[PDB]
DNA sequence: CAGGATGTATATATCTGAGACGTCCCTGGAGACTAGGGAGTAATCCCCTTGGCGGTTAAAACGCGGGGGACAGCGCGTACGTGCGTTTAAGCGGTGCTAGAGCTGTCTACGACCAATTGAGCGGCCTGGTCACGTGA
DNA sequence: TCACGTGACCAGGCCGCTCAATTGGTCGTAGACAGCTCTAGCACCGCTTAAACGCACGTACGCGCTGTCCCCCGCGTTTTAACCGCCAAGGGGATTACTCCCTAGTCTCCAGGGACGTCTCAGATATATACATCCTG
């Protein structure tokens, strides 16, 4: 569950980022804007799934998802 | 030609709403003054009988609380 | 010889108060809007039918780019108002 | 005599122009039956839901129509409406109080 | 031995600017995203290029958006990410 | 020229009756559209009004009779 | 002191008409596009089009903006709040 | 043919955008700020509107041509056209 | 003989004539809009691999990763904006340390 | 069969750079950026062509979708680009 | 500000999968011919764009004083950082297994096309429904 | 002062027509459903260990308060130019018509590019050292 994405690993997407020193209430309200996020995306992938006839996820559901949402995603076979 | 029924029509509406206001004046016999203050009188005795309605309705509620 | 949805949205608005009335340029943001929800549900279901490698666009189609473009209560409303349209029409 | 298939699937909004332009616009080789009933009556309802949301506001005023400013209110106040036209600029519609 | 505070951060920043890896754990994530599609329907399975897919989405979105946080915090005057900055950042980017 | 005086003492009478309407509507929003509509649902209000003052008049004294 | 600043706020808010002069607006438009093709004509109603889109997008700049100051801790616009909006909003 | 237009966006108008808004105060340096913001948005807007006009080959530019150039700019606008 | 050599060119021009004509873009696709289609596309990835190639000769690296792919784009204010929103896989980010956290 | 732009964005590196590689990955963006350019390159055009109601996508459609969809520079050098592709097309 | 401590940048064997090259092939692009449907050019014509002239008026521009709010500084008290030890789960490689992805092939039902008939709906003329005003005793 | 003739504004009705919608039949193909292969997604497991969790100590900065003063806001006055109407000319877009050449469709054929195999070397791991940067006293 979300508890899984630890604070460390909010700190080194924040260090990528480029902050200097971080918050102690920034992981609660990185979890619900990632969880929102992973929501939002993993919805249409999921209705392209189902529209396909199929039961299994496949990355170009996501690569369409994404791209759907103005964050076109280049790499997976899109 | 045309001007006529369109005439006769505003009068027909106009002394509708002036007879309108007479009914209600002789239900509202309280102002008698021309239309304008008349219709003022139709506005401010409206509002105190809906004030008074709902302060006899509380008050006699209060009453019937206490039995 | 324009083509508009006006008296569709005149006969719409009707239904649920009959006695108001529409501004002309409300009635334009209307069909506007219209064409815009036309343009934006053909297109994906447009690209819904190239991706399955199909080559028919069909109710499912417009059901899925509706399950898409438009948000949760609303969707559903769509959908219950679209299947109800299309069982009312084979229905005979 | 003959039926209309708007009056077939009792819509309001005419099947036969969305499926011209359906088949015209250029979206797929071929167009199924059902594709324009469903579409036709996506599109009647959320006409009619900005007609209702419009209506409401505009007798919150006094005014016996719409103008471009309650159609305005209408799709900010309700969240599906704004979620959905979150980039639509209303002519004459300014903002919210 | 002891670094003063600010020393570590920048080194960890110059290491995470110079590397393309991922951050996030795969099995933690992968975990994540199989309990939140139990909501939209039950018994999916995913292919391994498509949880992928969603972890480099993800993970991309959330390094934009802490570089805005952090944008917004300078312009606070301040050195820390707080809540308000996240919310800021999200509220003007429209989400 | 003295009837510009007249225009604006019929402007301001038009404006007084047409706020007290509009008080009236926002009073009794049942109709707004036309006059004739306004006068009618205040009319029918003023005759409820009047109808529940005689019966709740009429049970009080029925209460304090028997309690 | 900006006692009618918030009077100003809420009749403006309140209203739906335009707020920039519409002929400073036409000629500052013209100016813009000849630059890109002279004895260039412009339809009316693309004017007005144009108008009523800048001041939706000012509009909507200034709510950002305001929001930056407030989030300063201040209440008067600076153009580093201006600039935070636009770099933020990806522009 | 003209100069010096910029400076047609008056302080005033300004004002009243920044109010309609919600902002109570404003900076002396602001104004040139957002002249210079509008002046950016409207070339941006221009370019695209006159591009499609010089492809119809027409010396007008229609109101549909600034409505399909804010639409591909993702500004959509409706009451116009389209 | 080759249409893409007849014109010049590298790209496929006949699988772009059918990927135009196949595509549901349009009733007719005319002679030259391939052409021109390929030729710009191959203009593109000329541009993009030049790039990425000096950036991997910049690493001492002879084969190009998404990291070059990222940072030939990213560096380059017009191939940039014309990507601005994709995100490239294994991309990472360009450095970026604000001058307000730097030490002292 | 599946159809895949890595033969030519190969040679199209050769062309320039001797030994330089493309791993697989990068082989995969550079062909999903080519793919993402057509796409965008080509709705434009077919927009342009139903606006002014034409049936027809032609070179002059490519050009002004080209001009709208790159920026400045890159707009006028693809430009050329196609203009000598054509031109050495219809001269031969 | 010099000196020590940790760290990042520079210079070497082994190995190892993963780019790169040769071959088989098979199917999609190239050559040829066709018919008609869109593109293209010319001529019309009527709207609507530009241009000009005055008056009125709203709005803009300029000046001035008085806050009050930006900005700077000092004190401080905790919240974040850094670091060491413990431990928890991730990561990896392997083995089994079966659901379901992917492809093939009849084989029907459905959608495209054409011809025919006709009703929906745009536009314009016209009639009543509405508020509001200027007028007279 | 009381009360009233008349016109902006609009909704709706109705008809002309006219141009796309509905109906009916024919012919072809795509996708539906059945069936088969077999890829990879999933379940479990053991082992190594790298990252995570927790707690401790310290000081740096987020915050509060307090001052200075500057520059913005409200308001009075001058001026300027926007705006409204109203009239002119014309040029440019919308439209109709006809010609013809360009492209969609069909037929044949074969080499260009994809799939599959094998192979070596470019990069990764590991190790060694050289100079840099930071923090203390």
Known sequence: ?78 | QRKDSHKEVERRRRENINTAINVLSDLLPVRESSKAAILACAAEYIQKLKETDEANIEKWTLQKLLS | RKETYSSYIYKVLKQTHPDTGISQKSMSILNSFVNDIFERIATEASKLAAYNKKSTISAREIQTAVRLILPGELAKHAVSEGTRAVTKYSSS | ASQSRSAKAGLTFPVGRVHRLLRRGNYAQRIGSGAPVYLTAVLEYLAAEILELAGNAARDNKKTRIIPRHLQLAIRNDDELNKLLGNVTIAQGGVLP | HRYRPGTVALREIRRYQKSTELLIRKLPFQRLVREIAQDFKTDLRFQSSAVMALQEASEAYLVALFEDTNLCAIHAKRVTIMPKDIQLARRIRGE
């Open chain 1, 1 to 78: 569950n979300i508890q899984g994405i630890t604070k460390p690993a909010i700190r080194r997407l924040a260090r990528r980022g480029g902050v200097k020193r971080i918050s102690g209430l920034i992981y609660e309200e990185t979890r619900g804007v990632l969880k929102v996020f992973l929501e939002n995306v993993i919805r249409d992938a999921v209705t392209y799934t189902e529209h396909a006839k199929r039961k299994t996820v496949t990355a170009m559901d996501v690569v369409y998802a994404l791209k759907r949402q103005g964050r076109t995603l280049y790499g997976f076979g899109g």
